[PDB]
Amino acid sequence: TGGMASKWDQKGMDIAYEEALLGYKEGGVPIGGCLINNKDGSVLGRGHNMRFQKGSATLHGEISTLENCGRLEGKVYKDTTLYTTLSPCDMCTGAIIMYGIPRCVIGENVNFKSKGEKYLQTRGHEVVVVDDERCKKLMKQFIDERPQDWFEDIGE
Amino acid sequence: GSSMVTGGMASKWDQKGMDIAYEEALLGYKEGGVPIGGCLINNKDGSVLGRGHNMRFQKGSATLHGEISTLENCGRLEGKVYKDTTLYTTLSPCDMCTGAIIMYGIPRCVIGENVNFKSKGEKYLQTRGHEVVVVDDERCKKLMKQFIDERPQDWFEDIGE
Ligand SMILES: [Ca+2]
Ligand SMILES: [Zn+2]
Ligand SMILES: [Zn+2]
Ligand SMILES: [Zn+2]
Ligand SMILES: [Zn+2]
């Protein structure tokens, strides 16, 4: 779309936030997301961080989202938007780049931001930061109460 | 990617690491999956923290590339642990696996070969400061070449094409 928001952007961020809330309720890292087809707004998949729920070192919210979409032909990704409640780390950024997902809509980049946000732009992707306070407050609460668990999720 | 780019020194555990990575790739091939394997070794003592191979076909996974599967198999770890390890992979990493190495701060990546595949990740790793070593392992090259020959469409799916 460029500049103007996609008709499905609010739907996507609301779903990402719902996933983050669910993850928080399950005692995990409150980071969620979803992948939407820009063509019809269909939700290809949705998910949240599964580090605590599955003892996973790779299932960040974004990775879990992609995993939940299942095996897809490469072309499908080319016209989708990945929604994430928090700005992607270098790994999740790499996933978006590898699959060629053209747009990444981010809830906030205040609690966390890696060099990946800019790298996505360098690699030709459109990056949108909403600065969604609901996401920011939820993530901040987790960081406040379980700082070490947050650090573990990003190898800190 | 700069011009004054150099490879990296050799480690005493590199032979071991690539042998395990190759073993994982053969296992994956046996299981009917993508023959890409790896393992993570602690540079401090040579201990193998984990090993794995691509699980796209085995688990219907869109994210379990060989490198990702390897990290997953190590389980949850304190962030400091990754800081003195070497990630071994039979094939040069895509942008996602490169991102995983960068995020966790794994200081060294030893690659079997980059003849059958090479993404912008190999250079980006060096740009981000990581030590990269390409051993040009003929065992890995032959195995991957055969797979790409026999299953071109499946190879493309693994890299989203
Ligand atoms: Ca053929
Ligand atoms: Zn993240
Ligand atoms: Zn991530
Ligand atoms: Zn790969
Ligand atoms: Zn990869």
Going along chain B from its start, the domains and CATH numbers come out as 1-161 (3.40.140.10)
Element (H, E) at A52: helix A51-54
Query: Which ligand has the minimum distance to the alpha carbon of residue A93?
Result: 3
Tell me which chain B residues have a C-beta less than 8 angstroms from the C-beta of A95.
63, 95-96, 99
Enter the resolution in angstroms: 1.7
Q: Report the distance separating Cα B120 and Cα B132, nearest Å.
A: 13
Task: Give the nearest partner residue to B79 out of A63, A100, A151, using CB atoms.
Answer: A151
Q: Report the distance separating Cα B34 and Cα B104, nearest Å.
A: 24
CB contact, 8 Å: A155 with chain B? yes
* Helical packing angle, A90-99 and A61-69, nearest 10°: 30
Handedness of CA A67, A70, A71, A73 (dihedral sign): negative
Assigned token pair, B55: 């699980």
Please list the residues that pair with B134 across neighbouring strands: B111
Given a contact cutoff of 8 angstroms between Cβ atoms, the answer to whether B71 and B41 are in contact is: no
Q: Compute the nearest-CA separation of B70 from chain A (Å).
A: 10
Handedness of CA A128, B126, A63, A144 (dihedral sign): negative
Query: Is there a contact between A67 and B68 if contact means CB atoms under 8 Å apart?
Result: no
Residue A135, SS3?
helix
DSSP single-letter state for residue A5: P
